[PDB]
């Protein structure tokens, strides 16, 4: 009942404070001391802040038993910002992993690619892609008294772009594309980069060289922990959602569908918790945020 709104408000407070401190730390250091990964760190913090500012609205939404007293525009904006957080965060993790892959397997090629493609253009393309990919959510989201109750539910209307028969097709396509470009393809790139990184690192890890683990814990392992936490917080979301979509063609039993429907709010809750979890991860492993 009140557990989800309470966790949403706690994540709101913790994420706002932690992302504010992360932004302050990344934006107080001199440009020379600011690494190429700091832009990605700050973009992750900005996405987390942009989501947690709307988090109180969602906490009120779930507190009132899925009633939305904020309007169609704010439903559109909030859903837009959840999706923008998802794509921007996973694209930033992809960029961090690709940067580390360049810096490890082929550092000369890392310098070459950094010279060819600056950080600013990469970040701008990342955010433009996130915006354009979350455009369907903003376009189609609406508020309506679904189930003919006093509650106002912030849902997505497919009548603008599809009929009743094609509404299912558009829903499945949007879900599949969101999964593909937010978990499947970006994580595929991340595991490819991490596998090449693992080969290059193991080339020396076959020896003892335990100081290499601390050197990784500085930047590479904090990036790895960020990726792993993102995976563990968005795997319930995408897994349950994809299973629900596939149930129409696998003909799942009613019990399994009901279990997925009932457990999806908690999966969403963990996916939202990740935003506040990230600054704590920064403090625990990276001493730069701990020092500042």
């Amino acid at each position, epitope marked *: 009942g009140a557990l989800i709104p309470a966790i949403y408000m706690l994540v709101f407070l913790l994420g706002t404070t932690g992302n504010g401190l992360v932004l302050w730390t990344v934006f107080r250091s001199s440009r020379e001391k600011r690494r190429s990964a700091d832009i990605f760190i700050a973009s992750l913090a900005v996405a987390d802040l942009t989501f947690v500012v709307t988090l109180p609205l969602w906490a009120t939404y779930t507190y009132r038993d899925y009633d939305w007293p904020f309007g169609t525009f704010f439903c559109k904006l909030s859903s837009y910002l959840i999706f923008v957080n998802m794509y921007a965060s996973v694209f930033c993790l992809t960029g961090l992993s690709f940067d580390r892959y360049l810096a490890i397997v082929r550092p000369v090629a890392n310098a070459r690619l950094r010279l060819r493609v600056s950080g600013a253009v990469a970040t701008a393309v990342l955010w433009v892609l996130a915006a354009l990919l979350a455009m369907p959510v903003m376009v189609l989201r609406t508020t*309506g008294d*679904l189930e003919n*109750t006093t509650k106002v539910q912030c849902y*997505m209307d497919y009548s603008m772009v599809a009929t009743v028969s094609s509404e299912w097709a558009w*829903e499945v396509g949007l879900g599949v594309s969101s999964t593909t470009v937010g978990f499947v393809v970006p994580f595929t790139i991340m595991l490819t980069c991490y596998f090449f990184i693992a080969q290059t690192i193991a080339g020396h890890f076959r020896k003892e060289r335990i100081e290499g683990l601390r050197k990784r814990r500085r930047l590479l392992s904090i990036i790895v922990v960020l990726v792993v936490t993102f995976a563990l917080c968005w795997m319930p979301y995408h897994l349950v*959602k994809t299973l629900y979509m596939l149930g129409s063609l696998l003909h799942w*039993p009613c019990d399994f569908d009901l279990f997925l429907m009932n457990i999806f709010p908690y999966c969403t809750c963990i996916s939202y918790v990740n935003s506040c979890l990230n600054p704590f991860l920064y403090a625990f492993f990276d001493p730069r945020f701990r020092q500042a």
Partner: nanobody
Amino acid sequence: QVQLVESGGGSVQSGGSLTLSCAASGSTYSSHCMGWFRQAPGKEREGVALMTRSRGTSYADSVKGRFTISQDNTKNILYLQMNSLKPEDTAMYYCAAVPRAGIEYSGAYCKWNMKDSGSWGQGTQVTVSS
């Protein structure tokens, strides 16, 4: 797209326990969330038992408590146990299936606001005697 061939419609007297079994084809419990509607003569079609997700099974407070509705995902047949039927309940009964949205956006809710743009059946008039 669901062909809701609703059966079981009949006519009884006051206090009748008629059972309405709206059969369906293609309306899986995950895709289409079906419910029951009552059209009073000379007026717009009303609701009796609209199965929802937030409230579970919903009812019409003017007639709530007289009838029970349950869904069997095995044979995809929806029951409307129209018990204690009253002369105020004399009307036509339609069974409909609005397309239930996904869990990602609407939390798997039955878009009963789109009852106009939904599949319907035929039903049978229940002339409850006084």
